[PDB]
C-alpha cells in the first residue's frame, strides 16, 4: 500500500495503519529505484510470485527471518496442534457473492 | 343372507387388498475437532497432560 501511492479515501483505515509501520514511503523505495519505470511498462505484477500466509518470525535487530506457508494448513509453532489461518484487512478485500437473494449453489 | 321377496340372489365374492412399505431416512451430523481428535493418541507427559 506505500509503494504504490494510491490516494487515502480510497482504502481510508490501513492508511492510518501502514503509515504508522512506515515513513513516508521512501524507505522501501530505495532498494526498488525503478517504481517510476515498472509502472509504465507494466511489469511489476511479473515480478510478485504470492507464496502464502506467515507462520512464524524471528525478529533481530537488523534481519528478521520469516518462515511462510505454502500448499496448505500451515502448523502453528508457538500455540502447540494449532493452524494458522489467513488475516486480510477488511479495507482490501472486496467480497464478491453478495445477494438479498431477490439463488446460488452451495459446493 | 338370502330372503323371500324378488330381490336378485348373491353370488359369494372375494377382496384382494394391496398393502407396501415406506421407506424412511434418518440422518444426524457430528462435528469433531481436529486437535480433540488428535490429542487422543498423544502421549502422557505430566500430571497436567
Given at each position: 500500500?506505500?509503494?504504490?501511492?494510491?490516494?487515502?479515501?480510497?482504502?481510508p483505515?490501513?492508511h492510518?495503519?501502514?503509515?504508522?509501520?512506515?515513513?513516508?514511503?521512501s524507505?522501501?523505495?530505495?532498494?526498488?529505484?525503478?517504481?517510476?519505470?515498472?509502472?509504465?511498462?507494466?511489469?511489476?505484477?511479473?515480478?510478485?510470485?504470492?507464496?502464502?500466509?506467515?507462520?512464524?518470525?524471528?525478529?533481530?535487530?537488523?534481519?528478521?527471518?520469516?518462515?511462510?506457508?505454502?500448499?496448505?494448513?500451515?502448523?502453528?509453532?508457538?500455540?502447540?496442534?494449532?493452524?494458522?489461518?489467513?488475516?486480510?484487512?477488511?479495507?482490501?478485500?472486496?467480497?464478491?457473492?453478495?445477494?438479498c437473494?431477490?439463488?446460488?449453489?452451495?459446493? | 343372507?338370502?330372503?323371500?321377496?324378488?330381490?336378485?340372489?348373491?353370488?359369494?365374492?372375494?377382496?384382494?387388498?394391496?398393502?407396501?412399505?415406506?421407506?424412511?431416512?434418518?440422518?444426524?451430523?457430528?462435528?469433531?475437532?481436529?486437535?480433540?481428535?488428535?490429542?487422543?493418541?498423544?502421549?502422557?507427559?505430566?500430571?497436567?497432560?
Open positions: 500500500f506505500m509503494l504504490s501511492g494510491m490516494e487515502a479515501a480510497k482504502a483505515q490501513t492510518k495503519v501502514a503509515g504508522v509501520w512506515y515513513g513516508s514511503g524507505g522501501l523505495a530505495d532498494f526498488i529505484p525503478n517504481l517510476s519505470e515498472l509502472m509504465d511498462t507494466g511489469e511489476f505484477h511479473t515480478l510478485l510470485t504470492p507464496v502464502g500466509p506467515m507462520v512464524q518470525s524471528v525478529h533481530s535487530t537488523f534481519v528478521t527471518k520469516v518462515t511462510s506457508a505454502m500448499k496448505g494448513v500451515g502448523l502453528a509453532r508457538d500455540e502447540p496442534r494449532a493452524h494458522v489461518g489467513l488475516t486480510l484487512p477488511c479495507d482490501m478485500l472486496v467480497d464478491l457473492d453478495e445477494s437473494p431477490m439463488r446460488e449453489p452451495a459446493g | 343372507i338370502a330372503h323371500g321377496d324378488g330381490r336378485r340372489p348373491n353370488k359369494q365374492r372375494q377382496y384382494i387388498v394391496m398393502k407396501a412399505c415406506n421407506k424412511h431416512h434418518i440422518g444426524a451430523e457430528i462435528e469433531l475437532a481436529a486437535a480433540d481428535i488428535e490429542l487422543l493418541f498423544a502421549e502422557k507427559e505430566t500430571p497436567l497432560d
